[PDB]
Amino acid sequence: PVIKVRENEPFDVALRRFKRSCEKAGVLAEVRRREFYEKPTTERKRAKASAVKRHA
């Protein structure tokens, strides 16, 4: 996420724009996922469980 602060735009709006760009790019989510090792069996188990949850 690369955010460029615009003319006559407050700091509060620029930071909120950055926080949304990080949320869109999944910055904190990709760091949470890579922090610790996950077994192929575990990531396959998670993918199956999420696919079942995506049925309402």
Partner: protein, 117 residues
């Protein structure tokens, strides 16, 4: 002593600590401050307030060079990601750009085992 005016706000936000380094545009360090070095330990070290004071101590340590405008570079997760940028603007700096530079491997090294707590 010298004159820069246009700088770079390099902030290393880890889960345990926040290291704030003010550098020039080329990547040469001018002054730094950390949450751990600002009189905060363990429980209080890993707080956005300890990161706010780290941005404040860093601002006092670089105003002899005389910086007016600086572009922010955010690395890592944890607290002090946004509280450092907030403390830099309130200190008396014009934020040029806010960029996330968190390292993301294209699936490289095997991370350490999950902590069984």
């Amino acid at each position: 002593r010298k004159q820069v005016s246009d700088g770079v706000a390099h902030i290393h936000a880890s889960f345990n600590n926040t290291i704030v380094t003010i550098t020039d545009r080329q990547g040469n360090a001018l002054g730094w401050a950390t949450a751990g070095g600002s009189g905060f330990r363990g429980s209080r070290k890993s707080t956005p307030f300890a990161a706010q004071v780290a941005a404040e101590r860093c601002a006092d340590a670089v105003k002899e060079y005389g910086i007016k405008n600086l572009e922010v570079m955010v690395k890592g997760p944890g607290p002090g990601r946004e509280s450092t940028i907030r403390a830099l603007n309130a200190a008396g700096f014009r934020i040029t750009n806010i960029t996330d530079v968190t390292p993301i491997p294209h699936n490289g090294c095997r991370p350490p085992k999950k902590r069984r707590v």
